Amino acid sequence: KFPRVKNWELGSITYDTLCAQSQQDGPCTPRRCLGSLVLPRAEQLLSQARDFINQYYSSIKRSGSQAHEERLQEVEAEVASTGTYHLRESELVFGAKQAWRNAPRCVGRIQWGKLQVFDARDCSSAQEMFTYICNHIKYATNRGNLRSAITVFPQRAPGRGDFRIWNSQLVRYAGYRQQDGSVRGDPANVEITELCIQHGWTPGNGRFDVLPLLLQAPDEAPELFVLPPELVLEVPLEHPTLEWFAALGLRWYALPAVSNMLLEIGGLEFSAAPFSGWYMSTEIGTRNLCDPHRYNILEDVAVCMDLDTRTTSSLWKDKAAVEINLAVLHSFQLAKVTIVDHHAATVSFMKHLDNEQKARGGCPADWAWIVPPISGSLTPVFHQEMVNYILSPAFRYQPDPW
Amino acid sequence: GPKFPRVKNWELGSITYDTLCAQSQQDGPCTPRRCLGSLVLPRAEQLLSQARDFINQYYSSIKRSGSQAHEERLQEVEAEVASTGTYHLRESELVFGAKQAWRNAPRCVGRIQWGKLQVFDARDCSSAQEMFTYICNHIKYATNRGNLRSAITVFPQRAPGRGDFRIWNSQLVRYAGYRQQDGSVRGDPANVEITELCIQHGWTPGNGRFDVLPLLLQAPDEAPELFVLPPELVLEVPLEHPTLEWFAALGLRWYALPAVSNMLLEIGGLEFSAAPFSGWYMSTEIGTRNLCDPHRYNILEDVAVCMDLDTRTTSSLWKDKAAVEINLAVLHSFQLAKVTIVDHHAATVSFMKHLDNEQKARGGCPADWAWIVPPISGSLTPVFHQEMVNYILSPAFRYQPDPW
Ligand code: HEM
Ligand code: HEM
Ligand SMILES: C[C@H](O)[C@H](O)[C@H]1CNc2nc(N)[nH]c(=O)c2N1
Ligand SMILES: C[C@H](O)[C@H](O)[C@H]1CNc2nc(N)[nH]c(=O)c2N1
Ligand SMILES: N=C(NCCC[C@H](N)CNCCN)N[N+](=O)[O-]
Ligand SMILES: N=C(NCCC[C@H](N)CNCCN)N[N+](=O)[O-]
Numbered sequence: 001k002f003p004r005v006k007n008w009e010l011g012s013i014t015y016d017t018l019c020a021q022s023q024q025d026g027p028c029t030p031r032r033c034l035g036s037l038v039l040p041r042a043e044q045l046l047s048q049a050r051d052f053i054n055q056y057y058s059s060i061k062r063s064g065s066q067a068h069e070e071r072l073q074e075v076e077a078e079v080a081s082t083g084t085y086h087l088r089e090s091e092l093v094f095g096a097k098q099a100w101r102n103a104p105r106c107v108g109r110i111q112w113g114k115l116q117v118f119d120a121r122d123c124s125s126a127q128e129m130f131t132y133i134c135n136h137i138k139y140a141t142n143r144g145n146l147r148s149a150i151t152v153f154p155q156r157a158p159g160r161g162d163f164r165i166w167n168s169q170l171v172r173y174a175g176y177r178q179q180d181g182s183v184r185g186d187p188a189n190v191e192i193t194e195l196c197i198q199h200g201w202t203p204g205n206g207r208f209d210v211l212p213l214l215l216q217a218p219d220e221a222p223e224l225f226v227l228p229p230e231l232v233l234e235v236p237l238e239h240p241t242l243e244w245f246a247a248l249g250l251r252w253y254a255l256p257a258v259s260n261m262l263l264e265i266g267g268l269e270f271s272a273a274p275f276s277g278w279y280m281s282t283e284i285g286t287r288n289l290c291d292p293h294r295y296n297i298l299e300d301v302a303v304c305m306d307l308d309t310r311t312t313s314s315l316w317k318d319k320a321a322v323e324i325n326l327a328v329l330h331s332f333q334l335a336k337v338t339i340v341d342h343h344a345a346t347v348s349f350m351k352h353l354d355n356e357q358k359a360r361g362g363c364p365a366d367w368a369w370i371v372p373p374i375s376g377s378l379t380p381v382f383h384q385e386m387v388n389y390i391l392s393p394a395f396r397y398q399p400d401p402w
Numbered sequence: 403g404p405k406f407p408r409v410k411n412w413e414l415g416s417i418t419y420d421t422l423c424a425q426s427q428q429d430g431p432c433t434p435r436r437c438l439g440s441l442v443l444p445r446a447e448q449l450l451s452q453a454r455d456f457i458n459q460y461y462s463s464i465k466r467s468g469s470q471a472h473e474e475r476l477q478e479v480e481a482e483v484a485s486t487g488t489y490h491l492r493e494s495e496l497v498f499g500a501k502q503a504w505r506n507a508p509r510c511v512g513r514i515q516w517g518k519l520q521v522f523d524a525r526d527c528s529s530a531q532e533m534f535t536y537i538c539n540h541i542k543y544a545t546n547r548g549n550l551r552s553a554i555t556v557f558p559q560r561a562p563g564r565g566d567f568r569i570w571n572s573q574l575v576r577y578a579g580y581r582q583q584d585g586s587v588r589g590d591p592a593n594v595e596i597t598e599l600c601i602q603h604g605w606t607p608g609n610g611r612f613d614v615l616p617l618l619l620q621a622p623d624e625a626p627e628l629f630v631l632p633p634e635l636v637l638e639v640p641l642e643h644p645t646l647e648w649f650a651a652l653g654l655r656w657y658a659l660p661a662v663s664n665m666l667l668e669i670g671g672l673e674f675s676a677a678p679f680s681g682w683y684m685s686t687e688i689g690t691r692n693l694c695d696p697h698r699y700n701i702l703e704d705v706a707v708c709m710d711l712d713t714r715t716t717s718s719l720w721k722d723k724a725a726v727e728i729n730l731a732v733l734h735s736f737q738l739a740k741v742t743i744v745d746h747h748a749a750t751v752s753f754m755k756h757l758d759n760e761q762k763a764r765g766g767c768p769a770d771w772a773w774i775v776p777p778i779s780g781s782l783t784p785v786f787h788q789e790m791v792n793y794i795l796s797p798a799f800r801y802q803p804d805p806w
């Protein structure tokens with residue numbers, strides 16, 4: 001019943017008793033494990049709310065207290081008569097941080113405590129969303145000294161279109177599928193770059209053309225919005241020793257802000273709640289620039305290092321990959337922008353597992369996503385067994401609005 | 403769509419459904435509540451259903467399901483379990499099971515060679531001295547002067563009441579782990595327990611980083627005898643870098659033949675407590691885990707220093723850079739010495755081919771993602787992008803408790 005988690009580098013041992021608090025099922029069954037899969041293939045609400053309200057009041061050391069009880073009646077009352085209810089600013093703030101804390105695939109949770117929350121639940125239009133979104137960016141970016149933040153737009157409502165941000169991230173480079181089927185720019189954004197054009201956007205022809213934001217207000221065709229060039233900070237990549245690297249003209253935005261995930265708190269669902277902290281070097285240097293289905297610049301950088309790309313055993317792949325990540329870490333450091341390498345990042349996650357072991361008796365984590373895409377076993381997390389389960393508040397994936 | 407797990411390859415965008423899992427009879431460690439996929443070691447009536455299941459697998463394997471021989475064999479097996487409690491496997495039934503167990507091994511990335519396994523039957527073996535001969539024979543054949551060949555030696559099965567045949571060492575070839583006065587460990591920390599055991603048993607311990615441990619062989623109802631391997635049979639490879647001349651001066655070395663020897667081979671209900679197998683190494687096994695693990699040889703920081711890297715800050719990727727060189731060294735050194743080895747890129751590419759083949763053959767392939775993706779350059783290999791379903795199919799290889 002209670003998993004025995006072992007760290008094979010130290011010999012440590014713990015017992016995750018927190019997974020017992022999981023109220024929702026995962027993809028695995030005793031017959032088979034599907035943990036490596038990326039996507040998952042009134043009384044009810046009242047329970048998720050009653051449970052969440054409790055979590056909130058225990059959080060501020062006041063369970064049972066008058067306030068706690070009177071707040072439970074308010075929720076009972078609202079749900080019973082309208083089928084739904086709403087959250088108080090502070091409860092929203094507690095829920096947002098909890099959702100981050102429970103994010104099994106996030107390696108930056110050591111920071112879960114410092115999260116600037118913006119209540120944008122009084123939004124009426126895409127125009128208004130664009131403003132809120134622009135302020136989130138100015139704040140988050142804070143002149144290169146990034147600060148983690150989230151902006152929560154109106155929750156979803158029965159028989160009413162969800163507020164949505166069609167973009168995957170508030171900042172993404174366009175992907176133009178050219179004549180020969182190949183792609184110009186970011187191949188992961190081919191589809192979204194098209195929808196923008198379909199809605200009247202003057203496409204560029206560059207490899208890093210910052211896409212416009214397609215914001216959608218309830219039951220209404222989305223609206224195109226261009227982001228003020230200065231709000232979007234970008235770092236030009238160069239190598240600390242390879243003078244020719246800079247030539248490649250590689251660059252990347254500084255603000256990783258997810259905008260297509262749904263935030264569920266006490267039964268409520270927020271379909272537009274973009275959040276951002278800061279990048280882990282490998283996200284940019286290993287996955288965005290080296291995935292075969294992304295910019296795939298591995299071979300380029302290799303012929304540039306005069307590497308024997310003739311065969312796999314010469315490890316030209318691993319060699320080129322390490323330089324690219326080193327270039328990212330250098331550039332950001334130079335540009336004076338927050339970034340965290342996978343070594344510093346995972347040692348901090350180990351700390352996190354510790355703090356959480358004491359504080360809640362466990363920490364849900366997706367091993368396949370916590371271990372960096374490169375140098376895996378060279379980081380402490382690789383040798384750490386982990387348990388993965390769904391806790392609420394939580395960030396979830398949701399269908400594309402088209 | 404189909405009511406079987408849906409599998410996607412995020413690189414090529416291709417989809418497939420695994421229907422082979424419906425075949426699994428042994429439950430795993432996960433439940434809808436929590437996934438324990440990252441855990442390394444998660445904790446007659448029936449002997450017949452298992453044997454029956456295997457015989458069927460055998461006969462279909464040769465395309466004679468329902469035939470006379472098949473139905474007659476099923477009778478034979480029941481008749482034997484009915485009057486003795488157990489039963490024996492025919493020569494060819496064993497070769498089939500041994501290969502099927504490999505083919506079903508979720509953590510092996512080298513499955514593409516599964517059909518190319520040399521099965522040495524040794525179920526006649528009766529003495530520990532005899533176990534030593536077989537093993538020595540196995541190492542001779544498998545090493546084959548560097549041109550390694552997959553092989554497995556099957557010793558007598560667990561008999562009711564009677565003691566199991568067992569090999570105490572985790573591998574037929576391992577380096578001694580000497581616990582020091584000052585607390586450290588000279589050699590391979592992994593094998594400290596087995597060295598303290600070889601000594602409690604009469605071995606005269608050496609004092610190096612690469613002392614080849616002696617074999618502790620255990621015949622039914624007897625303390626293990628201590629046998630030391632003839633240096634001639636244990637092929638080793640001195641490691642040296644192709645452009646870092648000083649690397650060769652570290653005195654780092656590794657053996658050619660990787661031979662798991664403490665794993666249980668389960669075929670049709672029967673259990674073979676001693677059935678050592680071997681293939682050949684994937685460069686990262688040596689160059690990243692054995693030599694760079696914090697709890698193994700731990701040579702990362704040393705080699706890092708020799709490269710003039712800044713070991714002061716993690717942000718220099720000094721670990722990343724050194725690991726890459728240590729691996730290029732294992733590959734270079736193995737190639738030079740004309741010893742068989744495969745790198746993680748080549749290895750994983752063939753596993754992709756294996757999955758594709760297995761798709762058409764059985765409708766799926768059980769794989770442990772965390773174990774298939776290499777300890778380094780993970781997303782640079784195609785497996786990283788392949789979703790995988792993991793489950794237990796029999797025949798199989800299972801971890802088994804230490805005999806002590
Ligand atoms: C402050 C520094 C932060 C860092 C370094 C960080 C790093 C990461 C990394 C590397 C991943 C995996 C990304 C990928 O491979 O696609 C991740 C996933 C995630 N992070 Fe964080 N994170 C941070 C802050 C945040 C914040 C502010 C939130 C929420 C309030 C958050 C929520 C999540 C979620 C929900 C996921 C999983 C997304 C998915 O399933 O695709 N992270 N984070
Ligand atoms: C032919 C070349 C082969 C290659 C390159 C190969 C490679 C691998 C690798 C890289 C591992 C994981 C090592 C580790 O992380 O400790 C592994 C695990 C495994 N292999 Fe293979 N293998 C081969 C042959 C064999 C043979 C001949 C068998 C059995 C007949 C086999 C059975 C297994 C099993 C049971 C595991 C999992 C063992 C465990 O849980 O520790 N492999 N193999
Ligand atoms: C198929 C496999 O689950 C997939 O490629 C996962 C592996 N680990 C990952 N880890 C992180 N951080 N991010 C990812 O997108 C992935 N992709
Ligand atoms: C804790 C975690 O399960 C452990 O470090 C696993 C991860 N993947 C692995 N993969 C292989 N091939 N071999 C291993 O020993 C491991 N160790
Ligand atoms: N570093 C962060 N990374 C998350 C963004 C990357 C992707 N949008 C995650 N979802 C898609 C991956 N299949 N987040 N952050 O807040 O810092
Ligand atoms: N490549 C092979 N590797 C076997 C190594 C497996 C180790 N005995 C077990 N891992 C250590 C503890 N989890 N085998 N082979 O036959 O090629």
Ligand SMILES: [Zn+2]
Pocket residue numbers: 028032033034035432436437438439
């Ligand atoms: Zn699982």
